RNA sequence: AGCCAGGAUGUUGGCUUAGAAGCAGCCAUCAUUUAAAGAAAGCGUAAUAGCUCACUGGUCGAGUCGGCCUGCGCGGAAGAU
């Protein structure tokens with residue numbers, strides 16, 4: 001989550017798993033499922049929805065040039 | 067192992083040994099610290 | 105308290121001075137009082153260890169130059185331009 | 199020094215038989231065994247051995263020290279006898295022992311069949327354990343070493359031939 | 375107790391032993407019974423007081439049920455509801471910000487008499503000095 | 516460590532406990548935990564507080580350097596690991612008792628309790644002690660003697 | 664130097680963090696209990712947990728530690744008939 005240019009915000013330890021809470025950019029979550037699986041032996045749901053817009057890191061920004 | 071010209075201890079467990087004509091470094095904890103051409 | 109054995113210099117000049125320093129000796133001079141100056145030659149490692157203490161430059165100290173005890177104070181020191189060694193010392197007669 | 203300088207008891211029942219520079223030592227079990235020394239001076243008499251430098255070898259002492267140490271393990275060797283103890287780890291890892299040859303099944307496409315050298319013999323409490331007793335310390339080490347070599351313990355599931363006093367790494371994999 | 379076996383302390387609360395987002399499940403799920411810390415805890419709760427910080431250890435092996443133990447409150451925390459300010463800085467401790475009650479520190483420490491090594495109850499004070507010079511907050515002694 | 520100026524204090528202090536003491540026990544703390552000390556300090560605690568010690572020193576070279584003073588019955592204790600215990604006030608007391616009861620809760624060996632000095636001798640757990648003030652066992656020896 | 668032991672209590676110091684529990688950072692670095700044990704020298708942890716060190720007790724039994732100056736050497740060092 002951190003590697004994915006992400007900010008973390010909480011942990012519960014909800015019963016058996018451990019819900020982890022984070023704000024992580026869209027252009028960076030692509031194909032999460034695939035790897036989240038690899039990291040947790042297939043045992044790991046996840047979910048996401050829109051939250052906000054924040055500044056894009058420069059190398060990102062100057063890349064995003066049409 | 068790393069080869070280098072300057073070798074020196076890294077961990078507190080790195081040890082330094084002169085085998086054959088060559089100066090070496092052996093770490094019992096951390097393989098990354100092996101060194102030769104010293 | 106500092107006791108410095110020494111010997112009067114039999115040779116003077118750039119030539120000798122260098123020679124002395126090759127043999128862990130080193131020249132220095134005692135002057136002051138109303139009597140003439142005196143050309144001294146000191147054992148190096150000794151004065152070095154001695155002058156390691158700060159008292160060396162403050163205290164009065166004694167030089168036993170051919171059995172006399174002249175008793176003087178360190179005026180000036182010449183250290184090597186880039187080594188840890190001494191080149192020369194001025195001693196004032198007290 | 200120290201190790202050189204310390205003496206070394208010859209426990210009741212042992213032979214010893216110096217002849218110039220060739221010690222030999224029999225005891226309870228064990229094919230005796232025989233080393234050579236060089237710039238060492240070995241001194242019997244007493245119920246001990248003692249080692250010291252020989253005039254004119256700058257290598258002396260360091261030599262004596264080894265010498266003492268070697269002789270020592272011979273005494274301890276031919277008397278108590280020496281240890282061993284290996285254990286297999288990994289699905290499908292058998293060990294047999296027919297006479298003086300271990301029969302290992304280490305997930306290869308062929309058997310291995312490692313023949314024990316001379317003064318060394320092997321047993322198998324389980325299909326996943328090998329203890330081999332012997333007198334000659336230098337060799338006993340070697341054979342276990344050889345045995346470990348057929349499949350050095352890999353660091354992900356520790357699979358392969360272990361010692362037992364080993365430490366074995368183990369790293370978190372990291373797909374992908 | 376001459377033999378430790380399992381202990382995790384995550385300061386709970388008295389008035390209702392039935393959390394869920396803070397602790398809840400994570401306080402009892404490996405041979406532990408969520409049903410019995412509201413049967414048993416509260417049996418040792420109301421005799422004293424309710425609401426405030428409670429670290430705790432329990433006696434669960436893999437034996438189904440258990441028996442609950444009690445403990446003691448944090449000591450630099452008795453400098454919150456037992457001193458003044460409830461943070462500890464505001465000006466990072468490059469600045470010596472806090473402020474003390476010298477009277478307190480002994481009897482408010484003494485309240486933690488059952489968990490300290492000093493024989494001299496005055497000694498048990500001298501510990502609270504550094505515990506309360508934790509910022510560099512001087513005491514008007 | 517410290518030089519002599521400090522090896523002397525551990526003496527002049529520790530030997531004026533012998534010169535001004537009461538009872539002596541014994542114990543070898545191979546495995547001496549710290550829940551160990553913790554407890555025995557509360558025991559010293561009950562047994563006053565800091566009236567008691569145990570200063571590990573069995574360097575013959577130390578807590579025998581306090582022996583050719585008094586208690587030269589301890590040239591023989593001092594070998595190997597030891598934990599010397601001195602009493603100032605208190606009965607020739609209970610100090611004795613819990614060391615056996617403690618170490619008989621595993622709490623490590625007790626040197627087989629090589630024992631010590633009140634008399635000038637050796638081993639054997641006695642509660643011939645803190646009955647002390649059991650002069651009541653000579654009060655009941657009154658009315659019962661007067662009556663019976 | 665080995666080897667046996669211990670290596671603790673306030674307490675996750677305070678701050679700051681999603682989490683900083685000896686150990687990412689900032690400020691502090693006291694006080695207990697002591698034989699000794701850093702508000703911690705390193706491994707480790709999501710964070711705790713877990714393994715060590717410093718330090719002291721034991722064993723052992725005479726030398727041992729590391730800087731300064733200097734002589735001679737070692738690596739550093741691959742090329743084309």
Ligand SMILES: [Mg+2]
Nearest residue numbers: 085086087088
């Ligand atoms: Mg080679």
Ligand SMILES: [Mg+2]
Nearest residue numbers: 118119120122
């Ligand atoms: Mg010239």
Ligand SMILES: [Mg+2]
Nearest residue numbers: 739740741742
């Ligand atoms: Mg070349």
Ligand SMILES: [Zn+2]
Nearest residue numbers: 077093096099
């Ligand atoms: Zn290393």
